[PDB]
């Protein structure tokens, strides 16, 4: 499948190799929950591991399923 990543410079989406089928989106307010806040992470994953009350990650089983919460539509 294909998931969205935020490791590179800009945000893009690739096809996870023969290992990961699910995507993930991490969120946690960076010391600016008022201004900046919830840090947005992007990446692929095979399964949905645990998650702390703060640094949580939403895993899904679909393509381009882990887009930025405030990503521009189009």
């Amino acid at each position: 499948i294909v998931c969205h990543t935020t490791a590179t410079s800009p945000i893009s989406a690739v096809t996870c190799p023969p290992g990961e089928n699910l995507c993930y989106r991490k969120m946690w307010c960076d010391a600016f929950c008022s201004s900046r806040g919830k840090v947005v992470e992007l990446g692929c994953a095979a399964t949905c591991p645990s998650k702390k009350p703060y640094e949580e990650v939403t895993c899904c089983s679909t393509d381009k399923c882990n887009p930025h919460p405030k990503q521009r539509p189009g």
């Binding site: 806040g37 840090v39 947005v40 992470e41 930025h68 405030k70 521009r72």
Partner: peptide, 13 residues
């Protein structure tokens, strides 16, 4: 580095 919810730009640390 990653991005914050307040924007879509890259954010280093």
């Amino acid at each position: 580095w990653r991005y914050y919810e307040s924007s879509l730009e890259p954010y280093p640390d």
